[PDB]
Structure 1
Amino acid sequence: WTVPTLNPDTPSPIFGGSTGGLLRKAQTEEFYVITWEAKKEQIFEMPTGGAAIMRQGPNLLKFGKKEQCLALTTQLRNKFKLTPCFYRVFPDGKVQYLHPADGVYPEKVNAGRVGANQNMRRIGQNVNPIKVKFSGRMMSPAEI
């Protein structure tokens, strides 16, 4: 498996437009682009409000935050049994692949994933805040 590359010249689903789309953040900070493959033309619900028609083949959409892209991914996976993927696009043109990060969905275990933020103890074994006091900043006992 290899990381996919965003194709900016990808057809978008048939939508008449809405007022819940992108804002100035997309032009000044970042935005997100979701792409998927549809077996047939089908009407789905847009996470920003309204009903759009996904075309047969590739489909590309833009959203203001990652939650909208994942909500659309969940809707396409649970209802139409599709496999969507999204990226984070910056105004300079940089594209960053986001989900599924390793090509496999995170709900199923995949080899090569290194565990992060894992504490080899339980909650009851956490120390008291007094032992964490006078640190660099506000730190919780779970951070150590």
Structure 2
Amino acid sequence: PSPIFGGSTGGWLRKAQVEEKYVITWDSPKEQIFEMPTGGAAIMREGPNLLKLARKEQCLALGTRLRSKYKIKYQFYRVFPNGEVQYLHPKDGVYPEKVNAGRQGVGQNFRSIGKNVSPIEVKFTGKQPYDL
């Protein structure tokens, strides 16, 4: 279910079949023209749409344009060369901008920023001042 497009030279490279490639799925109620992140234009097909891209940003940039410009909503996948797929956006079905009970704290310092140690204190260690 790929959208209507005449092709372009700004698509995927070897990295796709050798390193991870990304696909994005969305559902549209009607046929409308949208801008390609690597290409100028394309007509989306009513029903489910499937697009393959080369970067997570390119996929997420299309989502942003699909969101506040068309009122529609999508899923990102990471595809490996062997065939294993990963589910990325949204992580738990709920968007990262909205709090969801069940999420946890990652990478949080429990103090303000002026409270980091001097670099001379962590001398000859394999760390850094912001990892204490």
Q: TM-score range by the shorter chain?
A: over 0.9
SS in 2 for 1:111: coil
In the other structure, the counterpart of 1:40 is 30
In 2, distance between residues paired with 1:102 and 1:134?
41
Tell me how far 1:92 sits from its aligned partner. Answer: 0.5
- Within 5 A, what are the aligned runs for 1:15-30? 15-30=5-20
**TM-score (ref. length: structure 2):** 0.97
In the other structure, the counterpart of 1:50 is 40
In the other structure, the counterpart of 2:107 is 117
Question: How many matched pairs?
Answer: 132
In the other structure, the counterpart of 1:127 is 117
**TM-score (ref. length: structure 1):** 0.89
Tell me how far 1:17 sits from its aligned partner. Answer: 0.6
In 2, distance between residues paired with 1:123 and 1:114?
21
Poorly superposed stretches of 4+, deviation over 3 Å: none
In the other structure, the counterpart of 2:131 is 143
Which consecutive residues of structure 2, in runs of 5 or more, have no partner in the other structure? none
Tell me how far 1:78 sits from its aligned partner. Answer: 1.0
Pair 1:103 & 2:86 matched: no
What RMSD, in angstroms, separates the aligned Cα atoms of the two structures?
0.8
